[PDB]
Amino acid sequence: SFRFCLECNNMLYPKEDKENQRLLYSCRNCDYTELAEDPKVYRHELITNIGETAGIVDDIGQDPTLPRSDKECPECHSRDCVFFQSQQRRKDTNMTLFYVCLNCKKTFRDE
Amino acid sequence: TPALTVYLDREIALDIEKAKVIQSSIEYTTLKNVTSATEIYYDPDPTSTVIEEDFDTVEAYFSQSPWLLRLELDRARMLDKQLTM
Amino acid sequence: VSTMRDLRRSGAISPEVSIIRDIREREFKIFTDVGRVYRPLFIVEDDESKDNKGELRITKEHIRKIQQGYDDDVYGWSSLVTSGVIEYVDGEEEETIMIAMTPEDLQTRSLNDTAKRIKPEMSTSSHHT
Amino acid sequence: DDTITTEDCWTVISAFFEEKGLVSQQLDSFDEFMETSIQDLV
Amino acid sequence: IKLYGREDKGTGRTIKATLPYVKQDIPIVIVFRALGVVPDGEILQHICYDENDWQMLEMLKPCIEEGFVIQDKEVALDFIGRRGSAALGIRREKRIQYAKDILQKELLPHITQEEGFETRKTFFLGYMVNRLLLCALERKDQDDRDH
Amino acid sequence: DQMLKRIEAHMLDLIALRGIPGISKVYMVKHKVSVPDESGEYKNEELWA
Amino acid sequence: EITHAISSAKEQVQEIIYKAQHNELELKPGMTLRESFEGEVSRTLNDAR
Amino acid sequence: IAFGFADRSLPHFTKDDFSPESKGFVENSYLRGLTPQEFFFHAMAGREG
Amino acid sequence: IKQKLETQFTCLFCNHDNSVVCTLDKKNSIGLLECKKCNLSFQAPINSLSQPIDIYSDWIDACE
Ligand SMILES: [Zn+2]
Ligand SMILES: [Zn+2]
Ligand SMILES: [Zn+2]
């Protein structure tokens, strides 16, 4: 979620403030610097589970090709809705089909 | 298709548990496997931390540049490979 | 997309123009090039505001007419396409359409012969549209 | 509107072939080329 | 568009584009700037339509890191024209217009060739890079070349 | 700041905890082999491997 | 006989899928969820044939 | 049989069907005669051979 | 490591081709050029994206 300045539009580089022992966020094409609300700088992981639910759309239901199921909807309690599995192309993707309703479209698992 | 056929010791060849131990020994699991997350928190104070995930733990353990390299691990991997943190 | 498809079926768009709609991408493409490949298909009424839903748009009237060769107020396959019962489709457009193998499947069936083919189970979608 | 039999489909297909035929695509492409393409190239 | 770099090899995952009538690749940010979107905010918003997808932000970040020597249309264009596969010594007099030609034309010609329509070209570049990264994120399948 | 990330990368990779280098995975294959017996006959004998 | 055998095999595959959906199917060593799932179903169908 | 289409083998079935017929199980024997989809799958196999 | 490039660039001043060497000094972000006939040299800061073509073009612009 990297951001820029509101008058220079260049990205903010976190440069340490040696004197005050505070983290700042200073650009380079301008002298506009602000406070650092959170000491986080860079965050990287190897066990990633992001993107499973990022494939949610509202036009899913109308599509006829989407299968039709008999599971119960905790929100609408309807008996005509579809379901789908995660859109992760990683080789470690599972078969936990993300059941979806036609009113709330909540992703919940029947495990 | 690189593949090895490793014969175990006569005792271990009939011993399932020692076979498991030997395999675990040979298996080349590196720290990359065990790691779960890596986050760089800027901790200005070397004496303590401003993060609640380990503030209590690091403080209880206690009793330079301030950049801190903080990484997370997956309990399942360490316990399955039997090596502790 | 609904109105554009209507315009095409009415003949107000050249049938070979393909109206492809992508949902998971939230995209909506249309193509008019030269060199695409297409084949015709019957138009199964699918809008749940009439009895004809789940039923073929074409009717015995049209077959009788085509046999005649002249419509009653040359009536050929082109008249069929333009009248709203058959529309061409390509591979890309096929990407997002559910088809019945035969007109019979359009109605759910109820036997057990020992010397004939057996239809696929097709039980993964308890409701079909 | 009773059910559409197989012979109905065969009727439709016969009408289709009669309108277009076998090599319709070859002839349509070549005629379109002669009518429009050459001129636009020039 | 080639996504350079390997896994912890090649350092940052820089994206270098290939253009017609050139002998060397170009960073994406440079072509963004040379076509009208010089600032970084416009560039990132055009490329990215999922702000929460921090992975895109950090993976295109190296381009941002190297895309700071260039800050205006003009040095960007000359950079493009400085590798225009043309003669040697077209100087900043005519080389800039050579770059502007090779950018207005010869690039995405199916979209347009007139001036004042770089918005279309930039939006198309953004879509292309977004799709490329998504494939690089394995959130969707690469199209089947036999399809 | 960049040096910290570089250390993070070199750490994630160039540290080896256990096992011979170059062994992605190992399999607890079971084996059967003809083995001579006391009487002189040859008898099967399941052995791990 | 053969029709009912086919029905039984299809039912077995049905239940195998039902389990694999629910992260309750055992993972074969050396293979992932999908690969082991496919291998199991293929073995089932070949055996039924 | 791969899902050459979007999340299915042939457009006639709905998305994400894993049942045998849905991924290339020819249920009937030659004497009974194949159904269309199964005939196509058989064609794929023969071409591959 | 400094590279001495005998590039095919021509010199504006000495009327000789291949008498120009566009040396590279990235250590201190400096440009150097050596000529072979009139021995003239051009100096200019260079960044990671600069190349002998860029140095040559900047030299031409400076000369004019
Ligand atoms: Zn700035
Ligand atoms: Zn619901
Ligand atoms: Zn000279």
XYZ file of C-alpha atoms and ligand atoms in Angstrom:
728
model
C 0.000 0.000 0.000
C 2.770 2.423 -0.938
C 1.712 6.063 -1.277
C 3.078 9.378 -2.537
C 2.976 13.073 -1.650
C -0.154 15.167 -2.188
C 1.702 17.933 -4.051
C 4.706 16.127 -5.570
C 3.145 12.693 -6.311
C 6.497 10.911 -5.921
C 6.782 7.945 -3.576
C 7.864 8.331 0.057
C 11.149 6.750 1.137
C 11.385 5.836 4.858
C 14.553 7.594 6.048
C 15.583 7.209 9.677
C 15.614 10.311 11.884
C 18.859 9.799 13.789
C 18.414 12.760 16.130
C 14.858 12.182 17.390
C 14.809 8.349 17.173
C 11.644 8.509 15.087
C 10.834 7.051 11.679
C 9.887 9.515 8.952
C 8.523 9.251 5.401
C 10.389 11.709 3.177
C 10.169 11.991 -0.599
C 13.092 13.044 -2.785
C 11.723 15.486 -5.393
C 10.381 17.627 -2.525
C 11.147 18.372 1.120
C 7.702 17.153 2.242
C 8.056 14.686 5.120
C 5.490 13.404 7.621
C 5.295 11.210 10.705
C 5.507 7.414 10.596
C 2.441 5.968 12.315
C 3.730 2.374 12.384
C 7.372 1.178 12.570
C 6.650 -1.339 9.791
C 8.882 -0.777 6.768
C 8.988 -3.958 4.666
C 6.882 -7.087 5.164
C 7.510 -10.276 3.173
C 6.284 -13.828 3.706
C 6.745 -17.322 2.300
C 3.487 -18.839 3.578
C 0.935 -16.752 1.657
C -2.839 -17.321 1.755
C -3.892 -14.093 0.018
C -5.871 -14.104 -3.223
C -8.195 -16.993 -2.361
C -11.146 -14.684 -1.631
C -9.889 -11.822 -3.840
C -11.788 -13.356 -6.773
C -15.265 -12.222 -5.687
C -17.639 -10.572 -8.174
C -21.316 -9.606 -8.144
C -22.161 -10.853 -11.665
C -21.400 -14.471 -10.717
C -24.968 -15.635 -10.114
C -26.561 -14.734 -13.447
C -24.008 -16.849 -15.315
C -25.804 -20.091 -16.263
C -22.566 -22.067 -16.576
C -21.989 -21.728 -12.833
C -23.158 -24.964 -11.178
C -26.164 -25.104 -8.882
C -26.095 -26.664 -5.429
C -28.308 -27.702 -2.521
C -26.395 -26.107 0.365
C -28.144 -23.729 2.760
C -27.431 -19.993 2.710
C -26.849 -18.612 6.242
C -28.003 -15.160 5.069
C -30.762 -15.735 2.491
C -31.511 -19.412 3.266
C -32.294 -19.797 -0.435
C -32.106 -23.042 -2.421
C -30.848 -21.726 -5.766
C -27.250 -20.494 -5.690
C -23.832 -21.358 -7.099
C -20.392 -22.233 -5.768
C -16.790 -22.123 -6.899
C -13.303 -23.182 -5.864
C -10.442 -20.769 -5.271
C -8.819 -19.115 -8.278
C -5.302 -19.796 -6.968
C -3.043 -21.240 -9.663
C -0.409 -22.078 -7.046
C 0.387 -25.781 -6.885
C -0.622 -25.747 -3.184
C -4.236 -24.723 -3.804
C -6.875 -26.870 -2.102
C -10.325 -28.138 -3.098
C -12.234 -26.058 -0.511
C -15.059 -24.860 -2.731
C -16.002 -21.275 -1.837
C -19.772 -21.511 -1.661
C -21.466 -18.240 -2.594
C -25.020 -16.990 -2.072
C -27.085 -14.820 -4.439
C -27.823 -12.030 -1.918
C -24.782 -11.746 0.380
C -22.306 -13.832 -1.664
C -20.531 -14.897 1.517
C -17.577 -17.231 0.989
C -17.958 -20.084 3.474
C -16.734 -23.676 3.411
C -18.721 -26.894 3.920
C -15.800 -28.697 5.627
C 15.227 -38.084 -12.680
C 17.910 -37.838 -9.983
C 17.198 -40.538 -7.422
C 19.080 -42.429 -4.728
C 18.383 -45.812 -3.165
C 19.790 -45.688 0.358
C 20.074 -48.969 2.239
C 19.589 -48.624 5.984
C 21.362 -50.555 8.708
C 20.213 -54.120 9.256
C 18.906 -53.092 12.664
C 17.376 -49.901 11.272
C 16.156 -51.579 8.067
C 13.760 -53.589 10.244
C 13.333 -50.621 12.615
C 10.668 -48.165 11.478
C 11.309 -45.499 14.127
C 15.069 -45.372 13.563
C 14.375 -45.272 9.834
C 12.199 -42.215 10.465
C 14.934 -40.598 12.544
C 17.581 -41.274 9.895
C 15.368 -39.924 7.122
C 14.595 -36.791 9.124
C 18.343 -36.390 9.582
C 19.183 -36.675 5.885
C 16.263 -34.536 4.723
C 17.692 -31.174 3.688
C 15.111 -28.871 5.265
C 16.466 -25.323 5.338
C 15.294 -22.313 7.312
C 13.377 -21.121 4.251
C 10.906 -23.961 4.770
C 10.235 -23.204 8.440
C 9.888 -19.427 8.058
C 6.316 -18.137 7.869
C 6.674 -14.346 7.655
C 9.320 -11.620 7.528
C 8.537 -8.049 8.597
C 10.921 -5.136 9.134
C 9.785 -3.099 12.149
C 11.690 0.099 12.912
C 12.318 -0.175 16.650
C 14.022 3.084 17.719
C 14.545 1.829 21.287
C 17.042 -1.066 21.596
C 15.854 -1.650 25.181
C 12.245 -2.512 24.291
C 9.772 -2.850 21.424
C 6.644 -0.986 20.353
C 4.947 -4.160 19.043
C 2.506 -6.204 21.128
C 3.221 -9.488 19.310
C 6.388 -10.004 21.384
C 6.488 -6.988 23.727
C 5.674 -9.096 26.788
C 7.968 -11.925 25.670
C 10.966 -9.756 24.772
C 10.511 -7.691 27.943
C 10.404 -10.821 30.118
C 13.438 -12.194 28.261
C 15.446 -8.999 28.823
C 15.109 -9.284 32.614
C 23.367 0.120 17.890
C 21.250 0.920 14.856
C 17.526 0.636 15.697
C 16.506 -1.237 12.533
C 14.942 -4.564 13.513
C 14.540 -7.607 11.252
C 11.588 -9.594 12.581
C 10.578 -12.940 11.081
C 7.793 -15.407 11.853
C 7.819 -19.205 11.740
C 5.206 -21.927 11.215
C 4.780 -24.154 14.269
C 3.682 -27.116 12.147
C 6.897 -27.241 10.119
C 9.217 -27.119 13.136
C 7.255 -29.750 15.039
C 6.990 -32.020 11.986
C 10.731 -31.810 11.345
C 11.107 -32.244 15.124
C 13.578 -29.339 15.387
C 12.652 -26.641 17.896
C 12.941 -22.902 17.360
C -25.194 -7.134 -23.087
C -28.845 -8.200 -23.064
C -29.911 -5.378 -25.367
C -26.926 -5.889 -27.668
C -27.779 -9.571 -28.013
C -31.365 -8.548 -28.742
C -30.149 -6.170 -31.436
C -28.065 -8.910 -33.027
C -30.883 -11.447 -33.009
C -33.271 -8.859 -34.451
C -30.787 -8.581 -37.316
C -29.844 -5.043 -36.352
C -26.304 -6.372 -35.873
C -24.429 -8.588 -38.281
C -24.712 -12.075 -36.737
C -21.026 -12.923 -37.203
C -20.236 -10.167 -34.713
C -19.748 -11.930 -31.389
C -20.968 -10.563 -28.045
C -18.682 -12.139 -25.434
C -19.174 -11.267 -21.771
C -16.522 -12.073 -19.150
C -17.644 -12.043 -15.522
C -14.632 -13.167 -13.495
C -12.659 -10.466 -15.310
C -15.513 -7.924 -15.158
C -14.788 -7.421 -18.853
C -17.052 -7.241 -21.882
C -15.540 -7.804 -25.328
C -16.983 -7.730 -28.845
C -15.278 -8.816 -32.067
C -15.906 -8.095 -35.759
C -12.758 -9.325 -37.492
C -12.275 -11.491 -40.577
C -11.024 -15.027 -40.016
C -13.042 -16.013 -36.964
C -14.876 -19.337 -36.983
C -18.498 -19.737 -35.934
C -21.327 -22.251 -35.941
C -25.086 -21.867 -35.425
C -27.176 -22.947 -32.469
C -30.827 -22.915 -31.501
C -31.976 -20.147 -29.171
C -33.444 -21.655 -26.010
C -35.686 -19.145 -24.274
C -34.176 -18.676 -20.819
C -35.783 -15.542 -19.342
C -37.904 -16.573 -16.358
C -40.863 -14.331 -17.229
C -42.771 -16.748 -19.480
C -43.564 -20.406 -20.016
C -41.119 -20.595 -22.928
C -38.162 -20.516 -20.529
C -36.397 -23.833 -20.936
C -38.142 -24.272 -24.293
C -36.878 -23.721 -27.807
C -37.815 -20.438 -29.433
C -38.313 -22.195 -32.777
C -41.738 -23.762 -33.314
C -43.496 -26.080 -35.745
C -44.738 -22.997 -37.583
C -41.193 -22.274 -38.714
C -40.523 -25.831 -39.874
C -43.737 -25.818 -41.888
C -42.752 -22.467 -43.372
C -39.259 -23.624 -44.318
C -40.826 -26.617 -46.028
C -43.086 -24.203 -47.901
C -40.205 -21.897 -48.808
C -42.417 -18.808 -48.504
C -43.528 -17.152 -45.290
C -47.196 -16.454 -44.596
C -47.250 -12.765 -43.705
C -38.205 -16.831 -49.907
C -38.330 -17.772 -46.216
C -35.087 -19.634 -45.640
C -32.417 -20.241 -43.038
C -31.629 -16.530 -43.151
C -35.217 -15.787 -42.153
C -34.698 -18.197 -39.271
C -31.528 -16.499 -38.061
C -32.978 -13.002 -38.387
C -36.312 -13.981 -36.810
C -34.760 -14.851 -33.442
C -34.258 -18.617 -33.147
C -30.665 -19.263 -34.306
C -27.522 -17.227 -33.704
C -23.953 -17.930 -34.749
C -21.328 -18.450 -32.055
C -17.550 -18.845 -32.077
C -15.147 -20.527 -29.680
C -14.607 -17.369 -27.657
C -18.347 -16.722 -27.381
C -18.913 -20.400 -26.576
C -16.699 -19.772 -23.563
C -19.695 -18.704 -21.439
C -22.779 -20.598 -22.632
C -24.455 -23.757 -21.356
C -25.873 -25.990 -24.084
C -28.274 -28.936 -24.114
C -26.885 -31.853 -26.103
C -30.298 -32.403 -27.717
C -33.782 -30.878 -27.494
C -34.827 -33.716 -25.190
C -32.495 -32.620 -22.397
C -34.295 -29.272 -22.407
C -36.961 -31.213 -20.507
C -35.846 -33.319 -17.557
C -36.469 -37.015 -18.198
C -38.003 -39.559 -15.809
C -36.303 -48.459 -19.087
C -32.794 -49.679 -18.241
C -32.171 -51.369 -21.583
C -29.240 -53.775 -21.804
C -28.204 -52.955 -25.400
C -28.266 -49.157 -25.860
C -26.161 -46.167 -24.903
C -26.733 -44.435 -21.564
C -26.790 -40.676 -21.120
C -24.248 -39.000 -18.820
C -25.390 -38.609 -15.228
C -25.089 -34.798 -15.237
C -25.897 -34.514 -11.519
C -23.413 -31.847 -10.375
C -25.956 -29.028 -10.908
C -29.345 -29.912 -9.443
C -30.860 -26.844 -11.156
C -30.278 -26.209 -14.860
C -31.077 -23.040 -16.824
C -45.920 -26.220 -30.060
C -45.213 -29.921 -29.665
C -41.729 -31.374 -29.361
C -39.308 -30.869 -32.236
C -38.405 -34.226 -33.755
C -35.114 -35.250 -35.318
C -36.642 -34.908 -38.771
C -37.352 -31.268 -37.949
C -33.646 -30.735 -37.332
C -32.887 -32.504 -40.596
C -35.346 -30.197 -42.355
C -33.630 -27.151 -40.887
C -30.222 -28.476 -41.899
C -31.407 -29.178 -45.436
C -32.670 -25.613 -45.727
C -29.362 -24.373 -44.349
C -27.245 -26.303 -46.834
C -29.500 -25.181 -49.655
C -29.009 -21.530 -48.745
C -25.238 -21.704 -48.192
C -23.927 -25.051 -49.427
C -20.514 -26.621 -49.071
C -17.825 -24.135 -50.095
C -19.826 -21.027 -49.255
C -16.960 -19.569 -47.222
C -14.465 -19.723 -50.096
C -16.824 -17.966 -52.488
C -17.953 -15.360 -49.968
C -14.368 -14.464 -49.102
C -13.269 -14.208 -52.721
C -16.284 -12.157 -53.762
C -15.854 -9.783 -50.830
C -12.203 -9.408 -51.795
C -13.039 -8.601 -55.407
C -15.818 -6.189 -54.482
C -14.071 -4.230 -51.722
C -10.535 -5.306 -50.866
C -8.703 -4.449 -54.092
C -10.192 -0.968 -54.154
C -9.167 -0.170 -50.589
C -5.607 -1.357 -51.182
C -5.259 1.113 -54.036
C 6.625 -6.931 -21.961
C 9.257 -9.057 -20.224
C 9.226 -9.556 -16.449
C 12.939 -9.723 -15.721
C 14.509 -11.134 -12.586
C 14.548 -14.534 -10.900
C 13.756 -15.777 -7.389
C 16.195 -13.916 -5.119
C 18.418 -13.782 -8.204
C 18.563 -10.739 -10.412
C 18.010 -8.606 -7.278
C 14.813 -6.591 -7.832
C 12.198 -7.802 -10.298
C 12.540 -5.023 -12.842
C 10.110 -4.847 -15.759
C 11.787 -3.831 -19.018
C 9.604 -3.296 -22.076
C 10.515 -4.008 -25.685
C 9.562 -1.559 -28.428
C 9.714 -1.666 -32.227
C 12.695 -0.287 -34.132
C 15.008 -0.364 -31.096
C 18.046 -2.410 -30.114
C 17.570 -2.295 -26.320
C 14.763 -2.654 -23.796
C 13.252 0.135 -21.704
C 11.870 0.245 -18.141
C 8.099 0.495 -17.885
C 8.164 3.673 -15.807
C 10.239 5.435 -18.453
C 7.666 4.729 -21.161
C 4.910 5.791 -18.766
C 6.611 9.148 -18.289
C 7.562 9.660 -21.942
C 3.887 9.220 -22.913
C 2.425 11.861 -20.605
C 2.193 10.300 -17.135
C 5.472 11.491 -15.628
C 4.356 11.443 -11.960
C 4.397 8.223 -9.981
C 0.874 8.503 -8.569
C -0.778 8.484 -11.986
C 1.512 5.661 -13.094
C 0.686 3.386 -10.170
C -3.044 4.106 -10.234
C -3.167 3.331 -13.962
C -1.181 0.096 -13.656
C -2.896 -1.027 -10.460
C -6.630 -1.470 -9.901
C -6.240 -3.483 -6.680
C -4.579 -1.284 -4.064
C -4.819 -3.983 -1.389
C -2.757 -6.213 -3.709
C 0.413 -5.142 -1.945
C 2.270 -7.783 -3.960
C 1.784 -5.790 -7.158
C 2.944 -2.631 -5.407
C 6.123 -4.215 -4.061
C 6.856 -6.088 -7.296
C 6.564 -2.950 -9.441
C 8.352 -0.972 -6.724
C 11.819 -1.846 -8.136
C 10.761 -0.166 -11.368
C 9.842 2.859 -9.253
C 13.229 2.609 -7.553
C 15.100 2.740 -10.859
C 12.525 5.075 -12.404
C 13.750 8.147 -10.548
C 16.638 9.336 -12.737
C 13.980 10.283 -15.316
C 11.487 12.914 -14.166
C 10.081 14.597 -17.302
C 8.816 13.850 -20.788
C 11.980 15.118 -22.406
C 14.876 13.145 -20.938
C 12.594 10.113 -21.107
C 12.001 10.648 -24.822
C 15.691 11.260 -25.485
C 16.472 8.057 -23.586
C 14.064 6.371 -25.978
C 15.538 8.204 -28.952
C 19.069 7.634 -27.688
C 18.446 3.943 -28.465
C 16.331 4.450 -31.568
C 18.346 2.060 -33.770
C 18.774 5.092 -36.045
C 22.020 6.753 -37.132
C 24.440 8.141 -34.538
C 24.316 11.855 -33.785
C 20.677 12.799 -34.327
C 21.236 15.092 -31.291
C 18.523 16.430 -28.990
C 17.308 18.532 -31.923
C 15.727 15.736 -33.978
C 16.105 12.738 -31.651
C 13.272 13.906 -29.396
C 10.899 14.073 -32.354
C 12.193 10.708 -33.546
C 11.161 9.304 -30.167
C 7.806 11.070 -30.326
C 7.222 9.548 -33.763
C 8.188 6.027 -32.699
C 5.823 6.449 -29.744
C 2.814 7.997 -31.485
C 3.195 5.524 -34.348
C 4.620 2.009 -34.556
C 3.258 1.471 -31.026
C -0.161 -0.102 -30.480
C -1.082 1.086 -33.993
C -4.416 -0.726 -33.829
C -5.583 1.792 -31.202
C -4.708 5.132 -32.774
C -1.990 7.184 -34.451
C -2.956 10.821 -33.790
C -1.697 13.088 -31.036
C -3.792 13.963 -28.014
C -4.898 10.343 -27.549
C -2.076 9.069 -25.346
C -4.698 8.405 -22.655
C -5.833 5.332 -24.587
C -2.274 4.089 -25.034
C -1.471 4.548 -21.346
C -4.654 2.798 -20.224
C -3.845 -0.101 -22.547
C -0.290 -0.339 -21.219
C -1.725 -0.366 -17.717
C -4.089 -3.206 -18.534
C -1.270 -5.158 -20.184
C 1.038 -4.826 -17.193
C -1.780 -5.575 -14.740
C -2.610 -8.804 -16.564
C 1.072 -9.716 -16.834
C 1.569 -9.292 -13.091
C -1.603 -11.223 -12.279
C -0.170 -14.100 -14.273
C 3.031 -13.466 -12.316
C 0.927 -13.764 -9.158
C -0.607 -17.082 -10.290
C -4.121 -15.800 -9.604
C -5.182 -16.786 -13.140
C -4.044 -19.178 -15.845
C -1.837 -18.246 -18.771
C -3.839 -18.335 -21.987
C -3.543 -21.560 -23.956
C -1.581 -20.903 -27.139
C -3.549 -23.786 -28.689
C -6.892 -22.270 -27.654
C 17.330 0.159 5.102
C 18.131 -1.770 1.922
C 20.936 -3.631 3.693
C 18.385 -4.990 6.158
C 16.284 -6.404 3.317
C 19.419 -7.814 1.674
C 20.320 -9.550 4.939
C 16.740 -10.823 5.110
C 17.042 -12.329 1.631
C 20.474 -13.881 2.197
C 19.131 -15.298 5.469
C 15.998 -16.838 3.961
C 18.250 -18.767 1.571
C 21.852 -19.497 2.578
C 21.209 -21.140 5.969
C 21.043 -24.938 6.161
C 19.630 -26.551 9.295
C 19.758 -30.305 8.727
C 20.361 -32.881 6.032
C 22.862 -33.426 3.241
C 22.799 -30.612 0.652
C 20.917 -31.413 -2.528
C 18.141 -33.654 -1.161
C 14.732 -32.135 -1.854
C 12.810 -35.050 -0.351
C 13.289 -38.607 0.887
C 10.920 -41.569 0.771
C 10.466 -44.288 3.392
C 10.344 -46.969 0.710
C 9.712 -50.507 1.940
C 11.581 -53.370 0.282
C 11.325 -57.138 -0.122
C 14.414 -59.279 -0.695
C 15.271 -62.961 -0.928
C 17.262 -63.939 2.156
C 18.820 -67.345 2.914
C 17.431 -69.103 5.966
C 18.860 -71.444 8.579
C 17.918 -74.608 6.687
C 19.475 -73.187 3.506
C 16.223 -72.047 1.910
C 15.624 -68.501 0.707
C 12.912 -66.578 2.526
C 11.460 -63.152 1.899
C 12.233 -60.422 4.406
C 10.579 -57.010 4.440
C 13.136 -54.260 5.038
C 12.750 -50.503 5.267
C 14.748 -48.278 2.943
C -24.029 -56.919 -13.120
C -21.710 -54.624 -15.053
C -24.110 -51.693 -14.858
C -24.300 -51.982 -11.083
C -20.518 -52.310 -10.913
C -20.249 -49.080 -12.897
C -22.750 -47.428 -10.560
C -20.706 -48.545 -7.556
C -17.493 -47.189 -9.065
C -19.195 -43.884 -9.854
C -20.481 -43.722 -6.280
C -16.972 -44.373 -4.963
C -15.601 -41.532 -7.070
C -18.478 -39.334 -5.904
C -17.576 -39.909 -2.266
C -13.861 -39.492 -2.968
C -14.626 -36.069 -4.429
C -16.914 -35.260 -1.516
C -14.066 -35.958 0.902
C -11.354 -34.214 -1.123
C -13.575 -31.129 -1.196
C -13.610 -31.046 2.588
C -9.874 -31.378 3.306
C -10.508 -34.773 4.882
C -8.808 -36.918 2.229
C -5.425 -38.270 3.277
C -2.456 -36.810 1.421
C -0.293 -39.396 -0.318
C 3.405 -38.811 0.476
C 5.363 -37.347 -2.412
C 2.205 -36.031 -4.103
C -0.017 -33.008 -3.570
C -3.751 -32.944 -2.892
C -4.779 -32.661 -6.535
C -2.266 -35.191 -7.841
C -3.088 -37.822 -5.226
C -6.794 -37.162 -5.774
C -6.427 -37.747 -9.514
C -4.303 -40.855 -9.025
C -6.854 -42.334 -6.637
C -9.809 -41.647 -8.919
C -7.922 -43.034 -11.920
C -7.094 -46.202 -10.006
C -10.751 -46.526 -9.013
C -12.034 -46.171 -12.567
C -9.434 -48.511 -14.054
C -10.268 -51.091 -11.400
C -13.997 -50.814 -12.078
C -13.393 -51.243 -15.799
C -9.348 -34.587 -19.807
C -8.281 -31.002 -19.208
C -10.682 -28.085 -18.720
C -9.898 -26.536 -22.084
C -12.974 -24.372 -21.580
C -13.622 -22.177 -18.527
C -13.681 -24.562 -15.578
C -15.024 -27.550 -17.512
C -14.251 -29.926 -20.344
C -17.090 -29.161 -22.764
C -19.487 -26.210 -22.595
C -22.500 -28.504 -22.191
C -21.749 -29.352 -18.535
C -21.704 -26.689 -15.849
C -18.490 -25.318 -14.385
C -16.337 -27.465 -12.087
C -17.597 -31.007 -12.648
C -15.090 -33.704 -11.679
C -17.240 -36.805 -12.173
C -15.874 -39.511 -14.492
C -17.951 -38.640 -17.551
C -17.164 -34.972 -16.911
C -13.453 -35.660 -17.416
C -13.355 -38.530 -19.880
C -14.954 -41.733 -18.611
C -16.638 -43.493 -21.528
C -19.412 -45.316 -19.703
C -20.860 -47.525 -22.441
C -19.203 -50.130 -24.618
C -18.744 -49.913 -28.364
C -21.703 -52.225 -28.940
C -23.978 -49.752 -27.191
C -22.313 -46.877 -29.006
C -20.738 -43.835 -27.391
C -22.471 -40.607 -26.535
C -21.261 -37.443 -28.277
C -18.975 -36.111 -25.546
C -17.482 -39.538 -24.997
C -16.916 -39.892 -28.727
C -15.003 -36.619 -28.736
C -12.885 -37.745 -25.797
C -12.127 -40.987 -27.605
C -11.056 -38.928 -30.606
C -8.650 -36.967 -28.415
C -7.130 -40.191 -27.123
C -6.733 -41.693 -30.584
C -5.102 -38.576 -31.984
C -2.692 -38.602 -29.061
C -1.707 -42.197 -29.735
C 36.555 -2.083 -13.662
C 37.118 0.656 -16.214
C 36.406 -0.376 -19.804
C 38.184 1.422 -22.640
C 35.691 1.272 -25.513
C 37.015 2.026 -28.993
C 33.504 2.679 -30.300
C 32.880 3.609 -33.920
C 31.909 7.142 -32.940
C 33.520 9.869 -35.039
C 35.080 13.003 -33.592
C 33.488 16.328 -34.472
C 36.734 18.281 -34.232
C 39.542 16.151 -35.701
C 37.689 14.876 -38.801
C 38.540 11.233 -38.021
C 36.302 8.215 -37.486
C 36.979 5.566 -34.832
C 39.245 8.116 -33.136
C 36.882 8.374 -30.140
C 36.894 6.251 -26.976
C 33.898 6.599 -24.646
C 35.374 5.311 -21.406
C 33.039 4.265 -18.589
C 33.520 5.302 -14.956
C 30.461 4.266 -12.954
C 32.308 4.214 -9.624
C 31.891 7.964 -9.052
C 29.121 8.590 -11.620
C 31.529 10.267 -14.049
C 31.786 10.202 -17.842
C 35.116 10.096 -19.658
C 35.905 10.134 -23.370
C 39.315 9.832 -25.029
C 40.049 10.967 -28.574
C 42.891 9.513 -30.624
C 43.811 12.341 -33.035
C 43.058 15.633 -31.260
C 43.030 13.789 -27.910
C 40.085 15.864 -26.676
C 38.127 14.423 -23.763
C 34.583 14.982 -22.506
C 33.445 14.630 -18.901
C 29.886 14.212 -17.650
C 28.039 12.453 -14.795
C 26.554 9.088 -15.766
C 23.863 6.986 -14.069
C 23.021 3.286 -14.194
C 20.862 3.814 -17.294
C 23.452 5.826 -19.243
C 25.408 4.176 -22.063
C 28.163 5.200 -24.499
C 25.436 6.363 -26.885
C 24.099 8.672 -24.173
C 27.572 10.032 -23.411
C 28.221 10.573 -27.115
C 24.923 12.412 -27.580
C 25.566 14.624 -24.559
C 29.045 15.342 -25.917
C 27.548 16.381 -29.252
C 25.040 18.630 -27.501
C 27.804 20.237 -25.431
C 29.979 20.853 -28.498
C 26.968 22.649 -29.991
Zn 8.497 14.819 -3.967
Zn -27.254 -17.332 -0.289
Zn 39.110 14.192 -32.326
